[PDB]
């Protein structure tokens, strides 16, 4: 009866998605984003269930809505873990640009790992490589069994990473390695879904992205039945003195919460059971989805829609008469 739900929860991400896109282009991220928080927490607040944000916008001080610890929810039916990110790709929501999503994951209470917001380096595959991967051996023999569980030379294996400075050293690595290497902008969300679309071309995403964002992508990866790693990590070990009194408040974070930076988390260490509703609205067009058009009173958009628990993927194309 929670797959009942499914569709509830693609309203919650078509109508933060169609409030992010009234602020398409306007150069103003801080509107752009408030339009869909405000959106998804108004049409959470209507579904029945006992949510409690696990990740979300920030801590109270700095988020007033969808903070870590908010309910949400009519407060019947189950008591579930929320994930939310009303709009992944707001700079982009903000200049117009490709590849800005509403996200929205929904599982068992206890089934995501509440991660401090720092960094985590990610390690994701699908299906046909589930159990072929490991962070504590080296990127090059991660890639080399990926390959051979794919059943294609090293040199056809491609590679998505975010295009950031951290990330040249093992850029430079792969291409050497004669890996094909999909540099993006954006953000680690969608790309790591690429994973497991088929007709998608890259394989594998590998680096350093937000832990928040790790677990979102952990709990749909899962529901995919692909595979992933991740790594916390503290700001001094990425990107100093700045970056240690900032990087020092993570593992105090991390402590007292209660777990330890640097060690190597499975699957099953971010999202803990199959019981995963993961729902994304496209925004702009990108890899993963259609952007919403308009003309006139009829908008349209388009919605993954996947449940862990089973045997199919939705794609929804949904004609909304505003």
Request: net charge negative.
């Amino acid at each position: 009866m929670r797959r009942e739900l499914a569709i509830e929860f693609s309203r919650v991400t078509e109508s933060a998605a169609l409030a992010g896109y009234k602020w398409l282009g306007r150069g103003d991220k801080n509107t752009a984003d408030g339009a869909a928080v405000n959106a998804m927490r108004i049409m959470l607040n209507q579904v029945n269930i006992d949510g409690t944000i696990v990740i979300g916008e920030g801590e109270i001080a700095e988020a007033p809505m969808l903070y870590i610890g908010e309910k949400v929810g009519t407060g019947r039916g189950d008591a579930v873990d929320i994930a939310v990110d009303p709009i992944e790709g707001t700079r982009m929501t903000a200049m117009g640009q490709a590849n800005a999503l509403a996200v929205l994951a929904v599982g068992d209470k206890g089934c995501f790992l509440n991660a401090p917001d720092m960094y985590m380096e990610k390690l994701i595959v699908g299906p046909g490589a589930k159990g072929t991967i490991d962070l504590n051996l080296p990127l090059a023999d991660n890639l080399r069994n990926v390959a051979a569980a794919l059943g294609k030379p090293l040199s056809e294996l491609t590679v998505t990473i975010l295009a950031k400075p951290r990330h040249d050293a093992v850029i430079a690595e792969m291409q050497q390695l004669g890996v094909r290497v999909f540099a993006i902008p954006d953000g680690d969300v969608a790309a790591s879904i690429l994973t497991c679309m088929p007709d998608s071309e890259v394989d594998v995403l590998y680096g350093i992205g937000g832990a928040p964002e790790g677990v979102v992508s952990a709990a749909v990866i899962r529901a995919l039945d692909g595979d992933m790693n991740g790594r916390l990590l503290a700001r001094h070990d990425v990107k100093n003195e700045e970056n240690r009194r900032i990087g020092e408040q993570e593992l105090a974070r991390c402590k007292a919460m209660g777990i330890e930076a640097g060690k190597v988390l499975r699957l099953g260490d971010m999202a803990r059971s199959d019981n995963v509703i993961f729902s994304a609205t496209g925004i702009t067009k990108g890899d993963l989805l259609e952007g919403i058009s308009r003309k006139g009173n009829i908008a349209t958009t388009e919605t993954l829609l996947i449940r862990g628990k089973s045997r199919t993927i939705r794609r929804i194309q949904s004609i909304h008469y505003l």
